[PDB]
PDB file of C-alpha atoms (C1' of nucleotides) in Angstrom:
ATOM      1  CA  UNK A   1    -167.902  38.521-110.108  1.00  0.00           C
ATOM      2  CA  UNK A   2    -168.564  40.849-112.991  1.00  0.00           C
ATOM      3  CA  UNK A   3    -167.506  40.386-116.584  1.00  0.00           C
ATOM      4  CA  UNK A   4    -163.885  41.097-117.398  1.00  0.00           C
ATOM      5  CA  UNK A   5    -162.822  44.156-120.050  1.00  0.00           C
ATOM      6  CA  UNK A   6    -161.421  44.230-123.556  1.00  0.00           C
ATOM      7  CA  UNK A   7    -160.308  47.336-125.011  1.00  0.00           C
ATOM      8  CA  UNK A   8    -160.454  49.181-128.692  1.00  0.00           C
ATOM      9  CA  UNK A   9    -157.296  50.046-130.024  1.00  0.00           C
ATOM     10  CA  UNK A  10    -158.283  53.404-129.233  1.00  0.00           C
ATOM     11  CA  UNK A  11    -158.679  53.189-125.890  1.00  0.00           C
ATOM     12  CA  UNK A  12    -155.830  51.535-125.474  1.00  0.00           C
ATOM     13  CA  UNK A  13    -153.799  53.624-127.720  1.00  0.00           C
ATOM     14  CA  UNK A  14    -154.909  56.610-124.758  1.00  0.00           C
ATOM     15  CA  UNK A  15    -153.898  54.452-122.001  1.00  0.00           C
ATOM     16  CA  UNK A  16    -150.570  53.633-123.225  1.00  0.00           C
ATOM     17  CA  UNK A  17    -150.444  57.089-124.143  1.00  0.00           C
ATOM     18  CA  UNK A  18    -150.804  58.499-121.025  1.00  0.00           C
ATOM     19  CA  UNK A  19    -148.918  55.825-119.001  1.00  0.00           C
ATOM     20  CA  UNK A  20    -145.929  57.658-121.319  1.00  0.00           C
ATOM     21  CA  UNK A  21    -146.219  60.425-119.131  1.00  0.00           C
ATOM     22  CA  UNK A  22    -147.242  59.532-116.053  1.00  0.00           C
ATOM     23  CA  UNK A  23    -146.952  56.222-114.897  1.00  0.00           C
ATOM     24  CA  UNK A  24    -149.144  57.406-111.814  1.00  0.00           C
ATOM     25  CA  UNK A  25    -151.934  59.583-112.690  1.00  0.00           C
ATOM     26  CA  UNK A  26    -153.703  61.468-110.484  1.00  0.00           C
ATOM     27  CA  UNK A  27    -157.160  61.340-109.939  1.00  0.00           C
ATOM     28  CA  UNK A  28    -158.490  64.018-112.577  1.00  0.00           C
ATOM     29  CA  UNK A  29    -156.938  62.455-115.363  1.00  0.00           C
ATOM     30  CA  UNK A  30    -158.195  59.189-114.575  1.00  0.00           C
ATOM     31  CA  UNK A  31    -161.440  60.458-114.427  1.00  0.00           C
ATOM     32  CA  UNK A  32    -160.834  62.210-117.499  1.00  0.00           C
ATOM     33  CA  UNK A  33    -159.432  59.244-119.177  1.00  0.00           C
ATOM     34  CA  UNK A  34    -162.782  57.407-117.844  1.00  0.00           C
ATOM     35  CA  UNK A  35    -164.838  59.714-119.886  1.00  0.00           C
ATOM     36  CA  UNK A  36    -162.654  59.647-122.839  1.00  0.00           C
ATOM     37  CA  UNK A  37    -162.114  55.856-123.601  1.00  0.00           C
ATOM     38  CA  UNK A  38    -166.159  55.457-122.184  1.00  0.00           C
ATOM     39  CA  UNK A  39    -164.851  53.106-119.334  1.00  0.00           C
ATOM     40  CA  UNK A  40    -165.031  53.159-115.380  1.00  0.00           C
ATOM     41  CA  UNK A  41    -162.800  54.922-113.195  1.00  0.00           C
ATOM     42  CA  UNK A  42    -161.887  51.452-111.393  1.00  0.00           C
ATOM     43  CA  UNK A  43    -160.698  49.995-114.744  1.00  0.00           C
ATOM     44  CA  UNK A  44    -158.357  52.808-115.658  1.00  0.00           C
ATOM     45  CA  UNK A  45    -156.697  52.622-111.941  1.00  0.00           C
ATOM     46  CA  UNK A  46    -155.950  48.436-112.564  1.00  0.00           C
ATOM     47  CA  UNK A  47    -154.754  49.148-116.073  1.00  0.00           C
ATOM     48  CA  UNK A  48    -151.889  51.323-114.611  1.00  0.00           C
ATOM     49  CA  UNK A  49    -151.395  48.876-111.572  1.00  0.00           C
ATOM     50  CA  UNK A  50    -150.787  46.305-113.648  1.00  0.00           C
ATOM     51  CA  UNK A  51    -149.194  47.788-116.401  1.00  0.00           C
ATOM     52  CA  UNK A  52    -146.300  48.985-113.778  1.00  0.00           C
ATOM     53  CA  UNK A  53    -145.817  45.692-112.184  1.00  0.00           C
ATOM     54  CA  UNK A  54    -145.288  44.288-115.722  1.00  0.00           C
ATOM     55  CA  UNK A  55    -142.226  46.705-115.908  1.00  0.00           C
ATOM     56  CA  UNK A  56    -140.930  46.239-112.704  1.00  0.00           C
ATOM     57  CA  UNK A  57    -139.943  42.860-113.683  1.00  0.00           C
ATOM     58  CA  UNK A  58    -138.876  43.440-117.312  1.00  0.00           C
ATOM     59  CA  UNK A  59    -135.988  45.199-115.448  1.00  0.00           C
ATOM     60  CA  UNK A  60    -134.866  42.821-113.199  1.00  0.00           C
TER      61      UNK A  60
ATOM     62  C1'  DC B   1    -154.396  60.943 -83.683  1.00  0.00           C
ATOM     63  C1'  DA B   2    -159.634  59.977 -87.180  1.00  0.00           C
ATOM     64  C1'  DA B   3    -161.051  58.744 -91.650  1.00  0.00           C
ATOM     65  C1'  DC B   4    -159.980  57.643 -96.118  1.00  0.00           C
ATOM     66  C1'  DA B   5    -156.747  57.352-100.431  1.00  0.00           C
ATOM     67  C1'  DC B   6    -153.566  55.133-102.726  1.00  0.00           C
ATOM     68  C1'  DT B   7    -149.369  51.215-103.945  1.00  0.00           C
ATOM     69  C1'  DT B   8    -147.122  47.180-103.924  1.00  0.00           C
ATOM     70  C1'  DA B   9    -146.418  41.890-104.504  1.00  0.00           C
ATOM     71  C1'  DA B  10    -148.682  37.982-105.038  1.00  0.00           C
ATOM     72  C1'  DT B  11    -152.277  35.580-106.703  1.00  0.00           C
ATOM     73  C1'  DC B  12    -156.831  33.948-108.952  1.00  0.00           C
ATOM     74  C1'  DC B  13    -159.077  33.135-113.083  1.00  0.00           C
ATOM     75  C1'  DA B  14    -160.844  33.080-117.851  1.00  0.00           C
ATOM     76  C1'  DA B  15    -160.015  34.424-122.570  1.00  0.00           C
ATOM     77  C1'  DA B  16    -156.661  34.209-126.206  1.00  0.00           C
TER      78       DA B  16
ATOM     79  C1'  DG C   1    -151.918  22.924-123.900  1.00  0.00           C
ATOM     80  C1'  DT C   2    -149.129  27.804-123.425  1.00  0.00           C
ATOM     81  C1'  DT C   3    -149.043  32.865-123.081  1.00  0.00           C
ATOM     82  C1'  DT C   4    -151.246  37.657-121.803  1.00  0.00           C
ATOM     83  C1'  DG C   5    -153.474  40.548-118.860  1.00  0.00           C
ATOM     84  C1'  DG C   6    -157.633  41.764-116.276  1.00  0.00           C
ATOM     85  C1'  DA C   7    -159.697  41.360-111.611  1.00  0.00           C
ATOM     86  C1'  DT C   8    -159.250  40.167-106.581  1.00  0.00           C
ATOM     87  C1'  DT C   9    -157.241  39.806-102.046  1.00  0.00           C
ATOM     88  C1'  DA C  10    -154.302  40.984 -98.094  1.00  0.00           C
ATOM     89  C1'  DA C  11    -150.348  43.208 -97.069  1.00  0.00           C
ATOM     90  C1'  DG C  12    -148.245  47.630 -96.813  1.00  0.00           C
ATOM     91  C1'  DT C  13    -147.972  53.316 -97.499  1.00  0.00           C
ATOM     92  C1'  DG C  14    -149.742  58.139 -98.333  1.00  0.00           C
ATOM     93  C1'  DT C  15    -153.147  62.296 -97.969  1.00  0.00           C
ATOM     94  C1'  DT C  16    -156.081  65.271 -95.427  1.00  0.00           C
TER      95       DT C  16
END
DNA sequence: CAACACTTAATCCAAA
DNA sequence: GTTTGGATTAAGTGTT
């Protein structure tokens, strides 16, 4: 395994930012949001997938 | 169709 | 001695 992530405010103030707007972001703007925050493009996609699931169920 | 890309639902697993 | 979410795995789907 590798080590698992914890996130500045700030980066997670952009990823809850941009899961306002899309809740599926392309590519680009993951990569983009990879550069911004300083983190992988793999940890950006798993954010969002399991940001969404934790919705799903809120609205059961 | 070949050849990859991405989601979803469920789960593992460690840190909080 | 519970709660939160990040990572992983095995099912799907979607794009090109």
């Amino acid at each position: 395994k590798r080590p698992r992530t914890i996130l500045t405010t700030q980066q997670r103030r952009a990823f809850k930012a941009s899961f306002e707007v899309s809740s599926k972001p392309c590519r680009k703007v993951r990569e983009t949001l990879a550069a911004e925050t300083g983190l992988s493009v793999r940890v950006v996609q798993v954010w969002f997938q399991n940001q969404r699931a934790k919705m799903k169920k809120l609205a059961r």
